[PDB]
Design a protein around this ligand. Structure first.
Ligand SMILES: Nc1ncnc2c1ncn2[C@@H]1O[C@H](COP(=O)(O)OP(=O)(O)OP(=O)(O)O)[C@@H](O)[C@H]1O
Ligand SMILES: Nc1ncnc2c1ncn2[C@@H]1O[C@H](COP(=O)(O)OP(=O)(O)OP(=O)(O)O)[C@@H](O)[C@H]1O
Lengths: 95, 95
């Protein structure tokens, strides 16, 4: 499992959110944040199966790209476990 | 050490916060976020010792459970280190 974090300009929220839906990813979390690189930013977190990693950074990158400074960055970390409180399903079954 | 992240409906904040206190966990961080699954959500992060993992997801799950869609999810990641700036204590001593 992986946790993929995208931090971008608040205006590209729509573009990345729709890109995500393309490959069947609707579950996600968005935090209003400030990035010093201080300006308003949108942080988007998404837990996925290992098999989807390259598929996700690909679609996100293209969705955010403009070629101009400030397109954003992608951060990847390992997720030891995910649990759906309602069912108790874990990992891939919890998504 | 582990980082346990709970994302739930803003109204269950109290229930989970009290559940946490039951097993002696008062240290925690809460972020107002939006979850697309877009609606206001409460993200609760809590760093703990390894020995407390099952104890924590157990109490949180029961505290949040209703059986109805939207009970929330739990995300677990490894924490390489924790430091208490004031003392310089690390890990379990930093909690
Ligand atoms: N090293 C970092 N550590 C933590 N947050 C970071 C780091 N680098 C960037 N960020 C976050 O990611 C956001 C997006 O970065 P952005 O792409 O705008 O950076 P830039 O340096 O201005 O341009 P570019 O990435 O195109 O060179 C930043 O506003 C900030 O919130
Ligand atoms: N795969 C994911 N990646 C990132 N954030 C997620 C993911 N799945 C859920 N979340 C976050 O967790 C919150 C709680 O999920 P919630 O339990 O409400 O999901 P659901 O699919 O509506 O219902 P259920 O979990 O009961 O099937 C979401 O609003 C979102 O902020």
């Amino acid at each position: 499992m992986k946790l993929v974090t995208v931090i971008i300009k608040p205006f590209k929220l729509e573009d990345v959110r729709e890109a995500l839906s393309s490959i069947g990813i609707q579950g996600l979390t968005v935090t209003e944040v400030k990035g010093f690189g201080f300006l308003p930013k949108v942080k988007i977190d998404v837990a996925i199966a290992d098999d989807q990693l390259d598929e996700v950074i690909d679609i996100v990158s293209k969705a955010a790209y403009t070629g101009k400074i400030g397109d954003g960055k992608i951060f990847v970390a390992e997720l030891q476990r995910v649990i759906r409180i309602r069912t108790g399903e874990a990992d891939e079954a919890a998504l």
